[PDB]
RNA sequence: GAAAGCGGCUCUCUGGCCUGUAACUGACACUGAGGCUCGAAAGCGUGGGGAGCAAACAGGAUUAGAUACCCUGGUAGUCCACGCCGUAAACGAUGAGUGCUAGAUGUAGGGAGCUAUAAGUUCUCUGUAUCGCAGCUAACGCAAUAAGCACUCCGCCUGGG
């Protein structure tokens, strides 16, 4: 629409000190089940607490590096000549898309509990390989085809 | 005749020499309009109010 | 194609000219890609056919377009209105296929007529400038009256 | 700032082909002619010069094709 | 065990067409051992005259010129296009010694008829 | 240049105007059916020349389909001497002759002054615009190179298919 109509803001964590704790609640939390959502998030820094026992931001922020790409895409046409001319949006939206990525693979895995397949992707996020880095290189390799800007 | 080179030109300086001066070469309008051949009554659509629109 | 909904909504249904409906929408199935749904919805009344209403709606997989149009004969409404569907697809060729369609202003004195140098006392008072942009009528050329800071009639004058 | 047609400068009538560049500053830098609009010419007096420039362009006294 | 040369002032024949571009580096009259095109690389599609693809096309044979071992460039550009400019700044900045970018686009004078209307 | 049309360059013989001019004829004027000539564009005849372009046709997209637009080509044909058709939006869908006259206006090339210690202006003629007095029409518009006001030569036109 026309304007920069305002967004909303949730508060950052005092427990493990990240706003993406409660934004991780903003993607795992479905049907407004915020207490179960915090049970999964606090249970996931508990998944850090068995595996490494370190700060949440090691696995959580290396995970953020895995799931925050550089580039995203856009449809831009001449009259049908859809040059996929790209953009590189800011870390609130990039972090938001990475939250879609961790809710994606840390949701849709046929394992035992939400903290068990989210133990597969928060613990494999502690293994910091595979699906996330490919889940951004799937757009990163396209940029050479996205070399055109407004040329023809 | 052709010096091809502005006075101690640099890369972007010769780029501005060829952009500016070779834009005032006229080296492109007759070519792009000479993409295709036209009827000679269209050659005087060329020789019409385009040039009169340029001056007057 | 996929599905119909044949509906004679005032008179009973008879599948000779309804089959003719089925064959001209057979020519919709000459101009089809996925004939997703149609619906016949027709209406004829009393008083020796002072109308002939017919309808078929067209939810195709991307576009939807209905047709509740008339003639005197219902047979002529099937004729001219399904031919209207043919010419509608003739309108829907390019509407379907051709998804490509292919500081100081560098200027002169803004005033027009020349004013003499005594009028520059009024010309400075004319528009509200301390100088007076006026081609001098008394003096041969251009003259202007400034405002000296002592408080008297000034003169911005090459003179 | 006058600089129109050079005719009042080389007043009059001479030659207009036995110069080298005195008449032939009508050249452009690319071996073609100065414009009749940038020069802004008196039309058939420009023809009185150009009707022998078209000779003197290509009389092997002048580069008729050039750039820069 | 093949014949090689060490020339220094090569002559860089680059033709920007209105769909593609050859990028060539040439001998003294000359002839080109280090040479390429855009279309040498597989940029066949809308990518045929993207100017940064033309930058790498004006980079690949440019760095292949050191097989011979030349650094100063005797540049000659012919023809315009939709990818010419970043190629121009490319070989102006391709580990080279840009001094003379020639402009040799040949000009007829109401010559042969082009092919017709469109 | 009546138009059709006419643009590398140089020669050959070649009309046609205008500016001045009464030197001179002394109305030789205007036209114009008939008849005659010229004349787009193709094509047709004979003989060449055969780059590039392109009817015809082929191949590839195109879509339901493509005998089309695009691309790849590619024949006739385009060019040269040499004969013909006589039909073109022939146009400006505005016949020819001459007279009249608000002006703002283009540009040629003369005639004259002109502005003088080199500058730069005014009148006059044919040209070709643009606006607009009057006049003007159904309106649109025309208007000094009148769609205004006159007369002589011609021509057309009679509701549509």
Curated annotation (Swiss-Prot), chain A:
GO BP field: translation
CDD domains per UniProt: uS7_Bacteria
One Pfam family hit: Ribosomal_S7
Classification via InterPro entries: Ribosomal_uS7, Ribosomal_uS7_bac/org-type, Ribosomal_uS7_CS, Ribosomal_uS7_dom, Ribosomal_uS7_dom_sf
Keywords: Ribonucleoprotein, Ribosomal protein, RNA-binding, rRNA-binding, tRNA-binding
GO molecular function, one term: rRNA binding
Any single Gene Ontology cellular-component annotation: small ribosomal subunit
Disulfide bonds: none
Stated family: Belongs to the universal ribosomal protein uS7 family.
Function: One of the primary rRNA binding proteins, it binds directly to 16S rRNA where it nucleates assembly of the head domain of the 30S subunit. Is located at the subunit interface close to the decoding center, probably blocks exit of the E-site tRNA.
Quaternary data: Part of the 30S ribosomal subunit. Contacts proteins S9 and S11.
HAMAP family reported for this sequence: Ribosomal_uS7_B
Protein name in UniProt: Small ribosomal subunit protein uS7
Lineage, highest ranks first: Bacteria, Bacillati, Bacillota, Bacilli, Lactobacillales
Name of the coding gene: rpsG
From Swiss-Prot, chain B:
Pfam families: Ribosomal_S21 (PF01165)
Compositional bias per record (Basic and acidic residues), positions renumbered to this chain: 30-41
Keyword Transmembrane carried by entry: no
GO MF terms held by the record: structural constituent of ribosome
Biased composition (Basic residues): 42-56
InterPro entries in the record: Ribosomal_bS21, Ribosomal_bS21_CS, Ribosomal_bS21_sf
Keyword Ribosomal protein: yes
Domain of life: Bacteria
Coiled-coil stretches noted in the UniProt entry, renumbered to this chain: none
Assigned GO CC terms: ribonucleoprotein complex; ribosome
Segments of this protein annotated with the region Disordered: 26-56
GO biological process: translation
Keywords, in A-Z order: Ribonucleoprotein, Ribosomal protein
The family this protein is said to belong to: Belongs to the bacterial ribosomal protein bS21 family.
Protein name: Small ribosomal subunit protein bS21
Species name: Lactococcus lactis subsp. cremoris (strain MG1363)
Swiss-Prot record, chain C:
Keyword Repeat found: no
One GO BP: negative regulation of translational elongation
Location of region: Probably still associates with ribosome: 1-102
Protein location: Cytoplasm
Tagged with keyword Transmembrane helix: no
GO cellular component labels: cytosolic small ribosomal subunit
Region (Required but not sufficient to restore ribosome dimerization, in vitro will replace E.coli RMF in ribosome dimerization): 103-159
Lineage of origin: Bacteria, Bacillati, Bacillota, Bacilli, Lactobacillales
Signal peptide (residue range): none
Subunit structure: Interacts with 100S ribosomes in stationary phase; alters the relative position of the 30S and 50S subunits.
One Pfam short name: Ribosomal_S30AE
Keyword tags: Cytoplasm, Translation regulation
Free-text note on domains in this protein's UniProt record: The N-terminus (residues 1-126) is homologous to YaiA and HPF of E.coli and can associate with ribosomes, while the C-terminus (residues 126-185) seems to be a functional paralog of E.coli RMF.
Protein name in the entry: Ribosome hibernation promotion factor
Residue stretches in coiled coil: none
Family membership: Belongs to the HPF/YfiA ribosome-associated protein family. Long HPF subfamily.
A molecular function GO annotation: ribosomal small subunit binding
Null mutant phenotype: No visible effect on growth until cells have been starved for 5 days; cells recover from starvation less well than wild-type and are dead after 14 days starvation. No 100S ribosomes are formed even in stationary phase.
From Swiss-Prot, chain D:
Organism from which the protein derives: Lactococcus lactis subsp. cremoris (strain MG1363)
Gene Ontology CC annotations of this record: cytosolic small ribosomal subunit
Physiological role: Binds as a heterodimer with protein bS6 to the central domain of the 16S rRNA, where it helps stabilize the platform of the 30S subunit.
Subunit architecture: Part of the 30S ribosomal subunit. Forms a tight heterodimer with protein bS6.
Single GO molecular function: structural constituent of ribosome
Membership in a protein family: Belongs to the bacterial ribosomal protein bS18 family.
Keyword Ribosomal protein applies: yes
The name this protein goes by in its record: Small ribosomal subunit protein bS18
One GO term of the biological process aspect: translation
Presence of keyword rRNA processing: no
Entry keywords, A to Z: Ribonucleoprotein, Ribosomal protein, RNA-binding, rRNA-binding
Domain of life: Bacteria
